Amino acid sequence: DMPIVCETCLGPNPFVRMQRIEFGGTCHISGRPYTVFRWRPGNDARYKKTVICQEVAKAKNVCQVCLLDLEYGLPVQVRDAAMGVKPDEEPQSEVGKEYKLQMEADASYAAGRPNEMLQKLQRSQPYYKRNQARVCSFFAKGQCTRGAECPYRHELPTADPALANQSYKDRYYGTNDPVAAKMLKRVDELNKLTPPEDTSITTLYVGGVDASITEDDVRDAFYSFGELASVRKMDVKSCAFVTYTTRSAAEKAAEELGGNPLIKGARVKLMWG
Amino acid sequence: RRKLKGKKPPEGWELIEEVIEDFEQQLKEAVNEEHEGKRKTELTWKIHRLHWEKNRFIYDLMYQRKVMSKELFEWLVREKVADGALIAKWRKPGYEILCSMLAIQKGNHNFGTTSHCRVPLRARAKQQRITPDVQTGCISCASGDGKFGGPVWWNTPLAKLEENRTTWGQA
Amino acid sequence: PGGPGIGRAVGRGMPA
Amino acid sequence: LQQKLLEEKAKKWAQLNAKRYGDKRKFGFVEAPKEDMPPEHVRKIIRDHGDMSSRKFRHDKRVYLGALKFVPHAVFKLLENMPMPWEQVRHVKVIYHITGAITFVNEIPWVIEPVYLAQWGSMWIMMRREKRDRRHFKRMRFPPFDDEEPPLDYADNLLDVEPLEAIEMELDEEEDAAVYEWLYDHQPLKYTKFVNGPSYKRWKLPLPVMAALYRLS
Amino acid sequence: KATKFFQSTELDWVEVGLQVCRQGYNMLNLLIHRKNLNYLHLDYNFNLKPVKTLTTKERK
Amino acid sequence: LKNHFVGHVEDAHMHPIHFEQQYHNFHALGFGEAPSGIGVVGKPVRKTTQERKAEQVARAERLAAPFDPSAPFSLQERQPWASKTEEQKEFIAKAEAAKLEAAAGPTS
Amino acid sequence: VVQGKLSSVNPTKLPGGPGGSTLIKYTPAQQGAQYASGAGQRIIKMQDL
Amino acid sequence: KEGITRTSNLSAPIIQLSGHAGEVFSMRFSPDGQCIASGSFDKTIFLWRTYDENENYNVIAGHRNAVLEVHWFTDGEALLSCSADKTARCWDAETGAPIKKMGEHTAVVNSCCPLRRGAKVFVTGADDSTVKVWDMRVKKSVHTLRSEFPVCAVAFADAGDQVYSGGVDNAIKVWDLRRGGGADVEPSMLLKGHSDSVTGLRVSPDGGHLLSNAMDNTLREWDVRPYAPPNRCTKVFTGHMHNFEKNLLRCDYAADGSKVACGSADRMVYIWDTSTRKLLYKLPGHSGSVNEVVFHSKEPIVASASSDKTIFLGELTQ
RNA sequence: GUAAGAGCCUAGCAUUAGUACU
Ligand SMILES: [Zn+2]
Ligand SMILES: [Zn+2]
Ligand SMILES: [Zn+2]
């Protein structure tokens, strides 16, 4: 009766004219005939249509269009990784998938605390630039006569060449989805604060600390991950020294608090002191 | 053929005859052009623009100069030389340079609208301000928008009138 | 001259 | 207020009550029926989608095949509207698919029946004169065209051929004067006071006309 | 005629008939070449000719 | 407890001017009315009497043109409209020729 | 059910025009002042093609 | 089960009236409370029974555009319909025939109110900024006053000598018709306090109070007693809504002056207790803006009309 | 001698979603 859609994939307009093509397509996952919806998110947009069944949509809490999760807008991998949940059991076969469907007809995503991981790795404002014309394939080959009139983007494709071959079923299930792979390697580096070649440096530098955070407040921060050798304030730099007694505790404190944690609101950075 | 069979055309037909036959020759060769290298939607754009210009000659003489007789015009409409519905429209206020009757058929359009070319170019968004209609090739046939007395077709510089439309006149 | 009207009993729907 | 705003506020309420209750906007409004295209439109659509063997029109193949269940209807509609031996050309109303997949003759061959019998009685007479008077009647070869050649292009081959004379009886002026200037028209009295109107239901013919019709017939 | 997929004109009958013949030919050949029977063809006079000599599987 | 799956879908009934008018105040202009009745949304991005008169002038001028009832009309222009960065794409197409020709050590 | 089985399964039923617009008011799960450009709900013109 | 004190004789406590094919812009209960006059955007008037079937026993046609406002005449057998097709029409209810169609206005005849004590006379205020008074038996309009801004809502006072008109001009005016037999009379009373247009006007069951709904999303209650304070403003109500629709949203008093019902654009039927100035009922169920609400003459029944082509017809429990 | 199928190489039907950095 209404698509299950990412609210980015409805564009800025509070009013939406959308075309409703009942039996307009086959679900890109369950291969099922379903009701397609087509619309132009905004004036700079193209016409996007739903890509999957409504059920196959609301199973994995993903948009019918972008196949991204509905709460955070990250691919189904990145959300399944932060959800920590098992690999997809759902049958890849379509005899299997339709059998699972016809079963579930005749007779876990809404009750989770907001994962900081997903929240940390998500876009603040909407990726409206995802609702925009493809790139003019005749502009690429240099043979576009349509001039600036082309409804297609007059730019060249600037994309990872292992990407641009993404599979629907794999972006919906979560297997070898190169975009979420790139994203998790990003978070792998950001979760990779370099523990230096010096093994004995047992201090962590805490920079960017706004003044209302006190030294015992950052002590309340860092006591959990190991014994503190000494904590040292200097508000002139808005920064702090924290030395521990064991290296692995400062390793813990880097690994958990490297991806920019916020102590009582202050966006603070960690470095190996 | 319809005019060429049997009967006589009313008085005046000798003035407009060569121009009408020229317009029919142009439409005859538009139908015969080759379509490789251009969109599927643009097949009929030249046909629509030429149909417009032909009926605009008939309109120009019948209602703007009024050098055409009611019986000659009614003959041209009856013998299918003039599009009677489209010339009839151009008489309506607000439809003065309408490009095609397709543009205002509302069952013709997905959302039950007229076409975006009927919308004054100002009140449109930059997306629908340089794209010609996919059926007619008209960018703007809103009265007020018209360059050179006609619509803003796919290639109408928003140059000189002579380079952008057929200019019959009486030499 | 009964017209094309009907009255049927229906609850009032609620948004929550 | 003070007409420094109340001017445009009142004018906006005025124009909105105008637009909301317009004649294009009101309830029983029906949109006007579709007008005809120029024939060059379907002519070109059908010439370009020539034999449906290009990649450009391939997403049209589905609908083209889907037109097949309507091909009996189109056949019937074409053949019920075939010209009659006294016509050289019949222009015929037609609805066509936007792709060129089917064309239907959107006409019915409505005849004033006494007129139609006069017409075919003339045909009878003149055909028998010709079978009599003609030294050698060469019959058409069937099939008229050979199995391998593609059907003609009308635009190319028939659009500017001037047809030929059709079969018509030389009607005696001063005796057939009643039915003389119009017997061999396609729909002979379509724009006169002798039919209900151009929809060509309901004739009403005078007495000398029916007399000539009965005689010819 | 009301459907947005049909338009209207006036054509010479002979033109519509040439149309209707080309269209029925196109339909029936699309049905042949859709069933993947690329060893048959319909010619222009509507005879279905095998362009080969067919096996019983193909003949079937 | 919600209606649709990701929110509440509720029937609406307006007069058709209002959908279109609001959809195009925001759609084209960028800024329009919130459909909830709460303010406005977003950020913003005629004709005359001398000009009207001058167009009436040009109309009456085309009327003032002499008509020669002897003369047939000719068609002079006869189809003028019909007969009618690059740098990055140059470099890209160079890369295309490169990856094209490239499309077409051991030691002891 | 019987009229569904008769009509839905009957194919001579001539197909026709566009199923008219129905308005709906849709209130999202996630409404923030960035989604719908700071507007709360959405009106959707649902046009059957 | 649930046995909550059936008030009325209606089969159910909430009845939806369907059969219209357009927005329903104004409705009215018969003086004897067993008829419904519903005027739709479909330029048609449905006549419903209030009991035992809710049968629309007649659909009267004859307006060429939306019938914006309907009242009944004091005896209940004649109906006054006002429209957008510039034509107000008097009909006979039992019969299905139109009696007198006066079309003297130049633009949409938004508002009308027939006089409840005296002769068969009704006021009509339209888009031409002119509020005209119309006596039944003459075929000319008996009075014609000219404001400068299009008239949205008009009412005829309880006693029968003054006319209340409110519109886009931010102030509602009371005019005296016997004081004016001339063509450019100046207004008698200027009730100010609404911050923009007025949409609906109802005369109180005692005649001392006038209800004004405003797209100031505010219901205001003024007193019309010729001996008043400097500010005739008495009451303010908050809660309903007006949106871009700018529909003709009206007022009503319960037959006892105990409640006040407003139509709103948030699809809600609002019913305040006049005294405490607070919200008694906030009834949902309408899919379009609620255009006018009418309280049944005898019982506490409230019936609402919406821009969703239906009319809910039900009783109040508390 | 049926004629069925498995596969190998090469083998022209359907799709419009997705491409981020304190
Ligand atoms: Zn989405
Ligand atoms: Zn391009
Ligand atoms: Zn146009």
Cα separation, G17 vs E6, whole angstroms: 12
Distance B158 CA to ligand 3 centre (A): 15
- Scanning residues 189 through 248 of protein chain A, those with a beta carbon under 7 Å from any atom of strand I turn out to be none
Q: Return positions of chain I under 7 A from a protein CB.
A: 2-5, 14-22
Give the distance (Å) from ligand 1 centre to CA of residue A49. Answer: 10
Cα(A127)–Cα(A11) distance, rounded to whole angstroms? 9
Q: In a 3-state reduction of DSSP, which class is residue D77?
A: helix
d(CA A159, CA D143): 61
Contact A7 G46 (CB under 8 A): no
**Chain G interface test: which of A1, A2, A16, A43 (most G C-beta within 10 Å):** A16
Q: CA–CA separation, G42 vs A5, rounded Å?
A: 12
Whether the Cβ atoms of residue A205 and residue A272 lie closer than 8 Å to each other = yes
Residue with tokens 């008077």: D133
- Classify the C-alpha dihedral H216-H219-H224-H229 as positive or negative: negative
Q: What are phi and psi of H192, to 5 degrees?
A: -115, 155
User: Which segments of A149-250 are extended strands (E)?
Assistant: 203-207, 228-234, 239-244
Residue E4: its chain B contacts at CB < 8 A? 107-109
At residue B152, what is the residue type? V
Give a three-class secondary structure readout of B17-40. Answer: HHHHHHHHHHHHHHHHCCCCCCCC
Q: F76 — contact with chain A (CB < 8 Å)?
A: no
B111 min Cα distance to partner chain G (Å) = 6
CB proximity list for D135: less than 8 A, separation 6 or greater: none
Nearest alpha-carbon partner for D34 in A114, B141, B104: B104
B7, with CB counted inside 10 A (0-12, 13-18, 19+), is exposed
Considering only CB atoms, which chain D residues are within 8 Å of E24?
Answer: 68, 71, 74-75
Paired with H294 in beta bridges are: H303
Task: Return residues 1-16 of C near H (CB < 8 Å).
Answer: 1-15
Would you call B130 and A148 a contact, using CB atoms and an 8 Å cutoff? yes
CA torsion angle B13 B15 B18 B22 (round to 10): -90
Alpha-carbon torsion A42, A44, A49, A50, what sign? Answer: negative
Give the residue nearest to nucleotide I20 (CA to C1'): A123
Tell me whether residues D16 and F17 touch, CB distance under 8 A: yes
Q: Are E7 and D145 inside 8 Å of each other by CB?
A: no
| Token pair recorded at residue H180 | 């004016």
Interface check A197 vs G, CB under 8 A: no
Both tokens assigned to A184? 């998790």
Bridge partner residues of B44 (DSSP): none
Report the distance from CA of residue B141 to the C1' of nucleotide I18 in Å, as an integer. 38
D167 CB neighbour count, 10 Å cutoff:
17
Dist. CA A25–CA A10, nearest whole Å: 20
**Which stretches of chain D sit within 8 Å of chain F by CB?**
16, 19-20, 25
The per-residue b/e assignment along H35-72, b for 16 or more CB within 10 angstroms, e otherwise, is bbbbbbbbbbbbbbbbeeebebbbbbebbebbbbbbbb
Nearest nt to the CA of D58 via C1' is I13
Phi, psi of E40 (to 5 degrees): -115, 150
Resolution of the experimental model, in Å, one decimal: 2.6
Nearest nucleotide to the CA of A120, by C1', is I21
Distance from CA of E10 to the nearest CA of D (A): 4
Rounded to whole angstroms, the distance from the CA of residue D63 to the C1' of nucleotide I12 is: 19
Separation between Cα atoms, residue H28 and residue H122, nearest integer Å = 15
Phi (first) and psi of residue G26, to 5 degrees: -120, 120
**Breaks in chain H after residues, C-to-N cutoff 2.5 Å:** none
On chain F, the residues whose CB falls within 8 A of the CB of B61 are 73
On the 0-12 / 13-18 / 19+ scale of CB atoms within 10 A, H231 is: exposed
E-interface mutation test, from D53, D77, D92, most E Cβ less than 10 A away? D92
Q: For residues D41 and B102, give the distance between their C-alpha atoms in angstroms, rounded to a whole number.
A: 12
Distance of CA H13 to the CA centre of its chain: 23
CA dihedral F25, F27, F30, F31 (to 10 degrees): 40
As a three-state string, the secondary structure of A66-133 is: CCCECCCCCCHHHHHHHHCCCCCCCCCCHHHHHHHHHHHHHCCCCCCCCCHHHHHCCCCCCCHHHCCC
Integer Cα distance of H151 and H163 in angstroms: 12
Where do the H-state alpha helices sit in chain B?
Answer: 13-32, 45-59, 70-78, 84-91
> For residue A176, what are its two tokens?
């070898």
Q: Which residues contact H272 (CB under 8 A, 6 or more apart)?
A: H219, H237, H239, H259, H260, H261, H262, H278, H279, H280
- Which are the contacts of A182, defined by CB distance < 8 A and separation ≥ 6? A160, A163
Q: What is the DSSP letter of A13?
A: -
Answer for A118: CB within 7 Å of strand I. no
Residue A191 phi/psi, 5-degree rounding, is: -75, -5
Q: Give which of B36, B42, B130, B139 to mutate to test A binding, by max A Cβ within 10 Å.
A: B130
Q: Which nucleotide is nearest to A51 (CA to C1')?
A: I17
Strands (E), H11-156: 14-18, 24-29, 35-40, 44-49, 56-61, 69-72, 78-82, 88-92, 97-102, 111-114, 121-125, 130-135, 143-146, 151-156
Residues 5 to 44 of F: which have CB under 8 A from any D CB?
Answer: 15-17
CA distances to B14, B15, B69, B82 from B10, rounded to whole Å, are: 9, 11, 9, 14
CA nearest neighbour of H246 among B113, F22, A12, A16: F22
Q: Which of F47, F74, F80 sits opposite B165 (nearest CB)?
A: F80
Is residue A136's beta carbon less than 7 angstroms from any atom in nucleic acid strand I?
no
Q: Is the CB of A124 under 7 A from strand I?
A: no
Q: Return d(Cα D15, Cα H8) in angstroms, integer.
A: 44
Q: Which residue has the tokens 């093994």?
A: A199
Interatomic CA distance for residues F22 and G26, integer angstroms: 16
- Nucleotide closest to residue A260 (CA–C1'): I22
Residues of D in contact with H170 (CB under 8 A): 1, 6
Beta sheet of H14-18, edge-to-edge order: C6-9, H14-18, H310-314, H302-306, H290-295
The three-state secondary structure class of H95 is coil
Q: Tell if A123 CB is < 7 Å from nucleic strand I.
A: yes
Nearest nucleotide from residue A6 CA, by C1' atom: I17
B138 is in an annotated binding site: yes
Q: In whole angstroms, what is the distance from residue H295 CA to residue H313 CA?
A: 10
Adjacent-strand bridge partners of H26: H39
H172 forms bridges with which residues in the sheet?
A: H191
Solved with: cryo-EM
**Which residues 34-73 of chain D have a CB under 7 Å from nucleic chain I?**
58-59, 61-62
Rg (CA), chain H: 18
Whether the Cβ atoms of residue F34 and residue G43 lie closer than 8 Å to each other: no
For every residue of D84-134, DSSP letters joined together read -TT-S--EEEEEEETTSS-EEE-------HHHHHHHHHHHHHHHHHHHHH-
Please name the amino acid found at residue B63. Y
Q: Show the beta-strand stretches assigned E in F1-102.
A: 7-11, 32-33, 40-41
State the Cα–Cα distance between residues H135 and H157, nearest whole angstrom. Answer: 15
Q: Which nucleotide is nearest to A9 (CA to C1')?
A: I17
Is omega for the bond preceding D143 within 30 degrees of 0, making it cis? yes
How far off is chain E from B80, nearest CA to CA, in Å?
9
By the 8 A CB rule, do A152 and A134 touch? yes
**For residue H307, what are its two tokens?**
């821009």
Report how far residue B110's alpha carbon sits from residue B131's, in angstroms, rounded to the nearest whole number.
17
CA distance H165 to B93: 36
Cα of B130 vs centre of ligand 2, distance in Å, is 13
Minimal CA–CA distance to B166: which of B57, B67, B33, B58? B57
CA B48/CA B141 separation, integer angstroms:
13
Which residues of chain A make contact with G23, given a CB cutoff of 8 A? Answer: none
Cβ-nearest to A15 among F9, F35, F88: F35
Q: Do D27 and H66 touch (CB under 8 A)?
A: yes
Which helix H or strand E contains F54, and what residues bound it?
Answer: helix F50-64
Residues D210 and D193: their CA atoms lie apart, in Å, by: 15
